[PDB]
Amino acid sequence: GFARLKRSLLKTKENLGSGFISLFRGKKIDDDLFEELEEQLLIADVGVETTRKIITNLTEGASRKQLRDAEALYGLLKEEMGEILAKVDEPLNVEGKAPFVILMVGVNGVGKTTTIGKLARQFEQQGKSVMLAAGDTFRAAAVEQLQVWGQRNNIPVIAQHTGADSASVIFDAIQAAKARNIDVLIADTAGRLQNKSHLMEELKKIVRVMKKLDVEAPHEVMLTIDASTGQNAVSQAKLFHEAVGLTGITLTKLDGTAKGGVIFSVADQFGIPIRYIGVGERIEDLRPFKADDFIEALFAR
Ligand SMILES: [N+]
Ligand SMILES: [N+]
């Protein structure tokens, strides 16, 4: 539903999508125009490298089509920015594994635990059996939050004492999931960026332990990032992807932020599928990402 998404993206539409119309009105296509467009893309948090790529491709496309009027750049931009998102438009498919293991990674303070609970409830409402692993083992509040989701939804939560070894919790959870014929296992993890090497080594150890039980696990390594944090979301994605290897992204807090343009930077810089976008705080506001809906909402005029 592109039309539902329009309200969520209003603040982002001030600079991107329909926000381009006033910039192009009555203008010719020249270096000054492309400089104005660069400024607007950057203020929208599209990022230096992705902005340069967009401008380069737009310039080449306009020249090849022999466009005269800047108004005609709008459709080329819609296509080119749409292609950026189309390259990461693969939905997450959790079917057919015993269990399908989602390792949730990211920094503290981006809502990883709440996102896990929302996804778990969604998979359960779809008829899948879910289990949760409380792998953020030194943060009692994170463990308790996961246990709240599990208790109210009759979803099992595997946890150990505060300070337990994360890899051992997740190992025990995979064993329990296999014993109990679970369809989907979602594992929380630590997120302290104070010691980056320690965090990445802990995640790598978790992955090695999983692989001993099922060489296909983890089936998804999902990053959660917060769109309202702007370029911090991009730097977080780079850290986890270069160190561990991501296979999916959930981007939260897109509603009301004018920094929604960061989705283009995340998509272009890393090429990792964007699985879900958050457009509100409720379970139902965590939506499967549809790049074409997103572009249509952004560029609606
Ligand atoms: N319950
Ligand atoms: N993978």
Swiss-Prot record:
GO molecular function, one term: GTP binding
Phenotype caused by lack of the gene: Deletion affects both cell morphology and protein export. Mutants are defective in the insertion into the cytoplasmic membrane of three topologically distinct membrane proteins, MalF, AcrB and FtsQ.
Disulfide bonds: none
Subcellular localization(s) per the UniProt record: Cell inner membrane; Cytoplasm
Keyword Membrane: yes
Binding positions for GTP per the UniProt entry: 106-113, 188-192, 252-255
EC numbers: 3.6.5.4
Keyword field contains Cell inner membrane: yes
Principal location listed in the UniProt entry: membrane
Activity regulation, short description: Conformation of the Ffh-FtsY complex and regulation of its GTPase activity are modulated by the 4.5S RNA. Formation of the FfH-FtsY complex leads to a mutual stimulation of both GTPases.
Role of this protein: Involved in targeting and insertion of nascent membrane proteins into the cytoplasmic membrane. Acts as a receptor for the complex formed by the signal recognition particle (SRP) and the ribosome-nascent chain (RNC). Interaction with SRP-RNC leads to the transfer of the RNC complex to the Sec translocase for insertion into the membrane, the hydrolysis of GTP by both Ffh and FtsY, and the dissociation of the SRP-FtsY complex into the individual components.
Family: Belongs to the GTP-binding SRP family. FtsY subfamily.
Domain notes: Contains an acidic N-terminal A domain, a central N domain and a C-terminal GTPase G domain that can bind and hydrolyze GTP. Contains at least two lipid-binding sites. The first site contains the first 14 amino acids (helix 1) and the second binding site is an amphipathic alpha-helix located at the interface between the A- and the N-domain (helix 2).
Protein name: Signal recognition particle receptor FtsY
Gene: ftsY
